[PDB]
Structures are given as structure tokens and as C-alpha cells.
Amino acid sequence: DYKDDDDANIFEMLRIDEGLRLKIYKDTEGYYTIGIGHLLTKSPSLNAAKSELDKAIGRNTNGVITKDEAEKLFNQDVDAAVRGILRNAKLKPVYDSLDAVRRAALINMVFQMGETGVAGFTNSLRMLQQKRWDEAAVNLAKSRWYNQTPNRAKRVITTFRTGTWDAYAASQQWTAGMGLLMALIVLLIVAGNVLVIVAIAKTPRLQTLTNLFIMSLASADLVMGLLVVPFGATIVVWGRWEYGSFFCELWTSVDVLCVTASIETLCVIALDRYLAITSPFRYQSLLTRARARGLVCTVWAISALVSFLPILMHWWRAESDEARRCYNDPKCCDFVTNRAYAIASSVVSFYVPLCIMAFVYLRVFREAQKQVKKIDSVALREQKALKTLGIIMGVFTLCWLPFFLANVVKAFHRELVPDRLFVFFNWLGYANSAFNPIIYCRSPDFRKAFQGLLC
């Protein structure tokens, strides 16, 4: 029938906003429920609920149904909302003035708040019936509704404002696009870094002292691909933190830990190659294989101290409205910090290692020119291995310097960094966990090592 597609459209709107379940389940109050919030019965008996389902559906479902049958239930719930809207003196005149798309927005609010809940938006309702859409969208956003479910509320409010479905089309392709891209990013990180660890760990040719440090660097990248990036992607895709306040702080701590360990490992590398080329005899006299393992544990030990300790102590916390409402919402895991912590933490964990790692390695890179004023083909074999260390140090500074310059600009004046931009700089740094294994293939020894392990 020519009216069928409007029922499918509003069904898909709420499918995105409330979700869909095709098997009977208990709602938070414990009543048997299926579909998009269709409450089957308040009776405790499960068979009474399947009985009510089989009546509405016209077959013996055994408590399982198809998408199309879930839409059949939902059309009945939509009729009940319309009846309630039509009997509410504040909502009926607005509903009568709206087209199908804006009626779907209003019906969607009714599913979330109820008629009385929507009826309390007395000024926004006046602006809708007055077709002052942009002003209705502003007043609607000034609400606890908007603050508690901003993703759904932005979509509904955009729908009242434009009169289109574009916010729901934009969402559904965002979940598919970014859901896929994030999946590939987690695999490219876990794949490239798991290979680098096993290659150095079981290739005798690769068991270089510098490769002992690179295994620390790849070990940081692998925790990123296992315990950090996968969970930060759910925020980028789902629009909220699903794992509670406790795992929010732990995730944040491991995230700060791995980044702090990486720049410190790059700094220890630059200090290793500087001692190696300025004082070779002290290098042989000082660095045993076991002491090199001690530097790694000391780096992670300093990193966990400078990462876990401030975070578990809540030294980072701020008093702003943005900060307190996130701290009191488990669904929010934004890392809102006080201006003091934003500086001291990023300086101790990053700028200081970045300057030493950048200052020392340049004096390393110039002394090699000071000792090789010649043309040579075998020199290319050693300029290449030195260049690889300067690429990894460079790609790290590129992937993460913007995130930390914005972090200090954000501290003095939040005006300048959009949250959209700051999140993008943070994912430029997450991408570094992918690049390193690719850069490790620049050297011939890793190259034949990767090629043998894959067959």
C-alpha cells in the first residue's frame, strides 16, 4: 500500500535510536518485551508472554520473530502514541501542523519521554506549530534530554529543523563506514605488532640491543591495538562509553601509559645510539644484555608512575559543568582535565622526552656525517639503518605532536580546538601504532624475517 513506506521509515528511525531485538527479553523493570520496546505482558509467566506474542503475530513464534514482524508490532505502538498525542491539548495542534517527517520526530520523543514529557516543552511546541524551526531546535537542545542522550537528541532535533531524514542517513553510514575502518585499524595494528615481537623474539639475527628497545615500542603499540584503540573506536562509532566508570579510568590510564612508554622508549633509543657512536668503549663497558632489560622495566615503571598515579588520584579532575556532568555519567568517558594537569602531564610524559629524543638524535645524525666524508655503496647499508631510527622518531612526532600542541592550546583557551578536531588529532596518534611495523620493514633483516614467518 502507498502508506507502507512511512511505517518502515519511522520504524528504521527508532531502530537506530532505541535498537531492535528479535527474541523475547526482560526490560529493566522485568516485564517481557520484544521488538522495539513492545511490552508483551506484565505477567511473570514466559508462556503468557509468548502467548501474547503469538496472538499479535498470527503464528507460533516461540518468542522469536523477524524484522518485518517486529515492525508489525511497532506500528501498533505508533498508533497508541498518535492516540495519546491527539488527546493531549498541547500536542494535538502541533501534531496537526506537521508533515510525516516532523511527526516522526515528535512521535520519537513520545517514545522516549511520554506525552506528558513532550508536553512540557511548551515553548518549543509553540515554535514548531509556528514553523520557527531553528528556534525550536535551540530550545529543544536546552534540556536534560539533550544532555543525557545527545546522539539521539541531535538526530531528532535535526529532523524537526530540516524536515528530512538526513541525520539518520548520516548516522547509518557512519556506523557502517567507521565501524569497518576501525575494524581494519585494530587488525593492522595487532597484526603488524604481533609479527614484530615474534620476529625479534625468535630470529637470532634480529636480537639486537636496539631491537630489544623496539620490542618495547612494539609492545606498547600492541597494547594500543588490544586494550585502547578497540575501546576508543566504540566511542567514535557508538557515540558513548558502554563499559562503566571503572573501566573508563582504567582504559584512560593504559592509554596514557602506552603513549608515555613509547616516547620514553624512543628517547632511550636516541640516548643509546648517542652513547654508541660518541663513546664506543663505554658502550661496550656499560650495557650488558641484562642491564638493557633493566632500562625497559625502568621506562615502563616511570611511565606507570606518571600515568596511573595521577589518574587513580584524580589529580586531573576539573570543576566545570562539562567535567562534573561527565564524571557523574558512566556513559561519558571524555578525558576532561584541569588546565594544570593538561600541562604538567603532557610535559612530563611527552614534551621533555620529545626534546631530548629530538635534540640528542640530531647530534647523533650529524656526527655520522662528520665521520663519513666519502662516497660509498656499503655506507648506504648503514645510512639506511640509521635513517630507520630517524623515520620512526619523525613519524611519532608527526602523529602525536598535533595532539599535544592542541592539548596545551586547549588548556589556556578552549575556544580554539573543536572537540571534532581534538578527537581527530588523537586518532592521528593512534595511527602511529600501525605505522611502526610498516617502517620496520625498511631494513633488510626484518624484511626477510617477516617474509619467512608468513610463507
Ligand SMILES: CC(C)CCC[C@@H](C)[C@H]1CC[C@H]2[C@@H]3CC=C4C[C@@H](O)CC[C@]4(C)[C@H]3CC[C@]12C
Ligand atoms: C597493558 C599493561 C597493563 C601491561 C604492561 C606490559 C608490560 C609487562 C610489558 C611492557 C613492555 C614489556 C617488556 C618489553 C620487552 C622485554 C624484553 C624481553 O626480551 C624481555 C621482557 C621485556 C622486558 C618486556 C617485559 C614485559 C613488558 C615490560
Ligand SMILES: CC(C)NC[C@H](O)COc1cccc2[nH]c3ccccc3c12
Ligand atoms: C581518549 C583519551 C583518554 N586518550 C589519551 C591519549 O591517547 C593519550 O593522552 C596522554 C598521554 C600521555 C600523557 C598525557 N597527558 C595528557 C593530558 C590531557 C590529555 C591527554 C594526556 C596524555
Ligand code: NA
Ligand atoms: Na564518566
